[PDB]
Amino acid sequence: GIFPVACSDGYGGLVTTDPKTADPAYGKVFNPPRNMLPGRFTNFLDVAEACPTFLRFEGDVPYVTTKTDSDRILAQFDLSLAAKHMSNTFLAGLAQYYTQYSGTINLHFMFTGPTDAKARYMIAYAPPGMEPPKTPEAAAHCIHAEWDTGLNSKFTFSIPYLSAADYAYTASDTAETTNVQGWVCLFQITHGKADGDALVVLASAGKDFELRLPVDARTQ
Amino acid sequence: FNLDVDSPAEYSGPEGSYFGFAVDFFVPSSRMFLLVGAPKANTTQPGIVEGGQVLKCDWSSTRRCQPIEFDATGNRDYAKDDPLEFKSHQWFGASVRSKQDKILACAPLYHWRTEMKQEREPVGTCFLQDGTKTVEYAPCRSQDIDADGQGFCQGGFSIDFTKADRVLLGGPGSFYWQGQLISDQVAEIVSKYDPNVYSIKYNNQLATRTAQAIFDDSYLGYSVAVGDFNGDGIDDFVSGVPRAARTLGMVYIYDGKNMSSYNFTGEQMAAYFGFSVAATDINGDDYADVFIGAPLFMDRGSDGKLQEVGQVSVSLQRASGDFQTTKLNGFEVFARFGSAIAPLGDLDQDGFNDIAIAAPYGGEDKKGIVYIFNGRSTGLNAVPSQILEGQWAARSCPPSFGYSMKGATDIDKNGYPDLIVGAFGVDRAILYRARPVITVNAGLEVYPSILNQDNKTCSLPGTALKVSCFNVRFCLKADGKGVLPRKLNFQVELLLDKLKGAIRRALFLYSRSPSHSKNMTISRGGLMQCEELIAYLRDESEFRDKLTPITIFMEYRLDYRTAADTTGLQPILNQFTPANISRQAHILL
Amino acid sequence: SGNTGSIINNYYMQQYQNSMDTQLGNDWFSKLASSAFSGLFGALLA
Amino acid sequence: TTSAGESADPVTATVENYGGETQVQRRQHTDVSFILDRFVKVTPKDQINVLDLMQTPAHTLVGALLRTATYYFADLEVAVKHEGNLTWVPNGAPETALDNTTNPTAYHKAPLTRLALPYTAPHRVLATVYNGNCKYGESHTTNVRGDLQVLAQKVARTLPTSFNYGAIKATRVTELLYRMKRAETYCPRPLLAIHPSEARHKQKIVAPVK
Amino acid sequence: EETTLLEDRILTTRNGHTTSTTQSSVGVTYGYATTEDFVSGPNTSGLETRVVQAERFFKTHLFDWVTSDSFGRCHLLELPTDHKGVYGSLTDSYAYMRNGWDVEVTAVGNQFNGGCLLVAMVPELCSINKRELYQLTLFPHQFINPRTNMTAHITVPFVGVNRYDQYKVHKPWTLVVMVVAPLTVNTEGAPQIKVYANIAPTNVHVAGEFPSKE
Numbered sequence A: 001g002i003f004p005v006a007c008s009d010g011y012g013g014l015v016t017t018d019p020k021t022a023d024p025a026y027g028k029v030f031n032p033p034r035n036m037l038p039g040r041f042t043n044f045l046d047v048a049e050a051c052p053t054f055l056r057f058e059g060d061v062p063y064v065t066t067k068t069d070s071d072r073i074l075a076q077f078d079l080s081l082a083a084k085h086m087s088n089t090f091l092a093g094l095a096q097y098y099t100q101y102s103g104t105i106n107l108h109f110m111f112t113g114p115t116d117a118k119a120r121y122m123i124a125y126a127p128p129g130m131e132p133p134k135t136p137e138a139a140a141h142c143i144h145a146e147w148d149t150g151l152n153s154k155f156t157f158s159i160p161y162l163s164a165a166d167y168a169y170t171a172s173d174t175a176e177t178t179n180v181q182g183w184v185c186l187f188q189i190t191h192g193k194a195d196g197d198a199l200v201v202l203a204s205a206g207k208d209f210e211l212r213l214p215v216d217a218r219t220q
Numbered sequence B: 001f002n003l004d005v006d007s008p009a010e011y012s013g014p015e016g017s018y019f020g021f022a023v024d025f026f027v028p029s030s031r032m033f034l035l036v037g038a039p040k041a042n043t044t045q046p047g048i049v050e051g052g053q054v055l056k057c058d059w060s061s062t063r064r065c066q067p068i069e070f071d072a073t074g075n076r077d078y079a080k081d082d083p084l085e086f087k088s089h090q091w092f093g094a095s096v097r098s099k100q101d102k103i104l105a106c107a108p109l110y111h112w113r114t115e116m117k118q119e120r121e122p123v124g125t126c127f128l129q130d131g132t133k134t135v136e137y138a139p140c141r142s143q144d145i146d147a148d149g150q151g152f153c154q155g156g157f158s159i160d161f162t163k164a165d166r167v168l169l170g171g172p173g174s175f176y177w178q179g180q181l182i183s184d185q186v187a188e189i190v191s192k193y194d195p196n197v198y199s200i201k202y203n204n205q206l207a208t209r210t211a212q213a214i215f216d217d218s219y220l221g222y223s224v225a226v227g228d229f230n231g232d233g234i235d236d237f238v239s240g241v242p243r244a245a246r247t248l249g250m251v252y253i254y255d256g257k258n259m260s261s262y263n264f265t266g267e268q269m270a271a272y273f274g275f276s277v278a279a280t281d282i283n284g285d286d287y288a289d290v291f292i293g294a295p296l297f298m299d300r301g302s303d304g305k306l307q308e309v310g311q312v313s314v315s316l317q318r319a320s321g322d323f324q325t326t327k328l329n330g331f332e333v334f335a336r337f338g339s340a341i342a343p344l345g346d347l348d349q350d351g352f353n354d355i356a357i358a359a360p361y362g363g364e365d366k367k368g369i370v371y372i373f374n375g376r377s378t379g380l381n382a383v384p385s386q387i388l389e390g391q392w393a394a395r396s397c398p399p400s401f402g403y404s405m406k407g408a409t410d411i412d413k414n415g416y417p418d419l420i421v422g423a424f425g426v427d428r429a430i431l432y433r434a435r436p437v438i439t440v441n442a443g444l445e446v447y448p449s450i451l452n453q454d455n456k457t458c459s460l461p462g463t464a465l466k467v468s469c470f471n472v473r474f475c476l477k478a479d480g481k482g483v484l485p486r487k488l489n490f491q492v493e494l495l496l497d498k499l500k501g502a503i504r505r506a507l508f509l510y511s512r513s514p515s516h517s518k519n520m521t522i523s524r525g526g527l528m529q530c531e532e533l534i535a536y537l538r539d540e541s542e543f544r545d546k547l548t549p550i551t552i553f554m555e556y557r558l559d560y561r562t563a564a565d566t567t568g569l570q571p572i573l574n575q576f577t578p579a580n581i582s583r584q585a586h587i588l589l
Numbered sequence C: 001s002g003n004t005g006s007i008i009n010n011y012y013m014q015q016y017q018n019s020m021d022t023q024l025g026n027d028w029f030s031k032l033a034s035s036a037f038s039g040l041f042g043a044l045l046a
Numbered sequence D: 001t002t003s004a005g006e007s008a009d010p011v012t013a014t015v016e017n018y019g020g021e022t023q024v025q026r027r028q029h030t031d032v033s034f035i036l037d038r039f040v041k042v043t044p045k046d047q048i049n050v051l052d053l054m055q056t057p058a059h060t061l062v063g064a065l066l067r068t069a070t071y072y073f074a075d076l077e078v079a080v081k082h083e084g085n086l087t088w089v090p091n092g093a094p095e096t097a098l099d100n101t102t103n104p105t106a107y108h109k110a111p112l113t114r115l116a117l118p119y120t121a122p123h124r125v126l127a128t129v130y131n132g133n134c135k136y137g138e139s140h141t142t143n144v145r146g147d148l149q150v151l152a153q154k155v156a157r158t159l160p161t162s163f164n165y166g167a168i169k170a171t172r173v174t175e176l177l178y179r180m181k182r183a184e185t186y187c188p189r190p191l192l193a194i195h196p197s198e199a200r201h202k203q204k205i206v207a208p209v210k
Numbered sequence E: 001e002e003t004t005l006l007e008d009r010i011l012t013t014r015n016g017h018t019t020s021t022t023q024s025s026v027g028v029t030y031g032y033a034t035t036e037d038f039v040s041g042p043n044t045s046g047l048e049t050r051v052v053q054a055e056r057f058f059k060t061h062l063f064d065w066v067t068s069d070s071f072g073r074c075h076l077l078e079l080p081t082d083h084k085g086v087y088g089s090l091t092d093s094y095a096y097m098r099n100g101w102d103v104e105v106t107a108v109g110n111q112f113n114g115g116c117l118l119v120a121m122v123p124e125l126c127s128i129n130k131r132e133l134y135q136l137t138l139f140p141h142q143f144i145n146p147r148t149n150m151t152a153h154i155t156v157p158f159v160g161v162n163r164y165d166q167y168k169v170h171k172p173w174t175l176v177v178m179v180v181a182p183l184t185v186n187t188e189g190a191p192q193i194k195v196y197a198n199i200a201p202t203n204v205h206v207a208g209e210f211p212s213k214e
Ligand SMILES: *[C@@H]1O[C@H](CO)[C@@H](O[C@@H]2O[C@H](CO)[C@@H](O[C@H]3O[C@H](CO)[C@@H](O)[C@H](O[C@@H]4O[C@H](CO)[C@@H](O)[C@H](O)[C@@H]4O)[C@@H]3O)[C@H](O)[C@H]2NC(C)=O)[C@H](O)[C@H]1NC(C)=O
Pocket: B446, B447, B448, B450, B451, B452, B455, B456, B457, B458, B468, B469, B470, B471, B534
């Protein structure tokens, strides 16, 4: 006779993400040539590394001005892709479609004031477990880097990926481990006649930044 | 109540020219004139049909209205065979405002070709004249063009002068009809004038900048008024925004020093709150009070039915910065009460400023009505002391008597300010004069007022019998401000037992009659004149009525015909002043 | 090449499954991120 | 790491700058071909549905990541729940054609029907952003507003009608899904997240026992 | 660069018979490609020709950068613009063109100014948003930081859905100049600063000559 086959139950339903191709309906079409077009990108994280985008601060500006008082905290925000400061970066607009990440986030700090304005800054990483620091002297016991302005006007610091698990969530739910990865605290050590300057700050992905498990929550 | 209605000054123009759409007084430096706006009047300007003109109407002697030449030219050209402007139907004279030697008229529908593409945008324009000088003032005619700019501004839709000689100009079409308030000092308007420059920049210009798109189609600058509200002497800017707040209507008040923002708001949808505004201190506290008109307001009656009557909101300015807002409703349905609001100054010279409100489409045959409201301590007396009626019938567009009006000007030097009313629908303009107010201190004394029937003191000639008599005594004293006769003759009337077909129980001795008249002639500001006479009771057996009090009535009438002056302006007696008083007398037992 | 967690290949010829490319005559943002200056730029002490 | 701020040269730093070590990473989930190869739901018209990819909701995964590239290529796969037979017609074909059975027509087979459709545009690559001649730009003016405003949409350009793979027509199309095959992308464009009102965009994640 | 505030990074650029020297340079940014793709295609039948007289700088004014301008102030210049040179007589002569751009933006105010400009070449810019300005560095860009430079030089190829373009109905590139940090005139800074562009087309190819009413 013919070949016996057992049509199994639970198989063959449409799955919107199955590794199967549809049946052809129309054949032998040749595309117009498109080899060597400018601007090809194959991976979304290749563009997130070669192209930093601005952060967002109080008043909706990409810069933080040099304050002259007993306070020296410029920015201090949750190390979270869902943070408010990160909300307009390409790295956080691309991470909203994934549930977990891993690796390093780079922050680019470009100083803008005139040639006679001078300042010294400090960026630290407060891991989760206790409150974040409020002065630079208390934050000097963290992982920090300190730079000052000169001929070279940009400094780049890599937020280290410390965590208990290998992956962390890109969303945030409640006060919980995976959604608070600590803080990142920007201080101003000194300044000389730098009143009202701007320190524009960018952000991008590190060498080992990773982002996996696609998802579709909402709101492009 | 003191306005002359018998023979008021009438002025007319070409039919269809809208003579009376705008009116004002013109007092230079020592003759007095009248300014009437006729925005549809044909001019001799080269190839311009209905350019509109403003007429200076001679009040002295004859009723001649000589037109005023602000601009005799036609449409200037941008290039060869490319007109720059369109003065045809520009509605020049739609708004006329004068201050001493300075006359400002405007053309809200003046269109202008851009300095780029060939457009036709109604930026509006104005012409300022200072005696021999005459410049052009088009603040909306600028580089900012086309709807979102000042292209459809129609600058000059409403105008007003401040006390520091600064012009306030309104344009309801700027920035997609958000509207715009523009203020320039009269100094720079002429000083920075340039006949070859179409967009003049003024160094000291105050203006409302463009706002968010949700403020579009609000019509700021629809109407304007000036007055101080922050207590620094400088006139501030009051303007109606009738489409603001989703057609609820608003009224903005800006600082007259830096265009810094009070804000009024309406209670009813599409009632056109802000169609007209006026600022005058109504309660004598030297604080400018805000008057806002909403002619389309609907009210409910005892039958609970909606009826469009119109409404004016009287906001008294308190030193607290707050306002004491009182709402005054219209009287006739669909008459649009509150279309025009005109401060009159102290019309009756009583100590408080007065104001006039019009229902242009009211009265019999839609002629028009103007209501006169007097001010007092508590605020504005809500009851009108006078009702001015139109006297002309319709042709196509209704007479619109009261659509525009102007007051607060003593044009005849009688010490009392007058009023102009424009009825453009019939191309007429009317000047009402204010008659001099005479306050009168009338007096009446009856002594003794308790009559003893058996007293029998005063003898009576002709008979040996004596009668119970007593004294009646009346006094007059009158005085008034402004120009008025120093002699005043009155007609005094006296009646005994006024309460009584019935028998009068008292009569005058030297006449034997209950009635007595006395031609009395007192002097203005002079002493109190007082004539007395003897009245007597009837005999006890002549009447049974002994319980009813005998009322003594005094009444007086002024001779208006002989009190007239030069033109025949007859004075009037003060309102709320009793034209007659009465005392009584009792009998005992 | 794209979405596969399985490899069941095709009944049909490539000439019917897809549209065929033509040659005339990972490119940019992969060379641009790989040319990223990673090393420290100063004179590192300690 | 210091550097010239405005060189526009990509400058990466690492955790070796302060004693760490860069770990290895797997990046298969952000590959353009991998991530764009899903079915995405599209709101269908009643009968006729021109198969444009810019008809996808922009807030979706495939919608938002497609609009992150100026130019794109892909073959298309379609899933359709319809009533009656479903006809396809290639790019540039008249509407009257949707009625003829000789064109690729799939007879009704429950519950749905998935077809592999080629690339039939005259263009070497399609576009998400089309601007024939539009911007000044200089932060565009308020000049056209109110009524003229809602008409003013096209004072510029942007029209995906020309860039159409084709159309489908059934008596009643109930559900429609697109799947991009062999997706190539060029010239990346902005991609935005949800702007939070708090200091951080909190949300409700699935909650097991512990 | 140099040991002092004084600055010597010389860069010269010759397009045609027109040069341009800068002493405060950061380098040229290449966007999306270093070379060109295939000019000869199956859509012009080999009737395409290169016009070498059209490849030379032309100048244009962008905007005044004043201290009152805050973050997000844009200036959009759609390329190709209205050109009165020989490159302009190509859109009236030929129906199809293709070319890259060599864009050099200048903002001269002394090094005692603060502030920062971001000049970027954006393809197919139909609409920009306030939040999308935060990700404007996804495009070929350079910053103009008055303490360090006055010039931003950006070279960029031809992009489109077609191999040749009809520039009378399509503007593929757009030069956007954005304020990322407002200007400051501290004590010695220049009060305002004018921004100019010095653009030059590259590899211009034309095809299909139209009739002439001459
Ligand atoms: C009886 O009949 C005779 C005649 O009619 C009455 O005569 C009157 O006497 C009055 C009181 O004397 C008198 O009042 C006026 O003259 C007064 C001086 O003679 C004078 O003092 C009064 O001023 C004051 O008067 C007013 C009056 O209202 C009082 O209110 C004040 O308190 C003061 O007293 C008056 O100027 C009156 O003129 C006089 N009239 C006549 C016609 O003779 C008499 O009063 C009667 N008496 C009875 C029985 O009632």
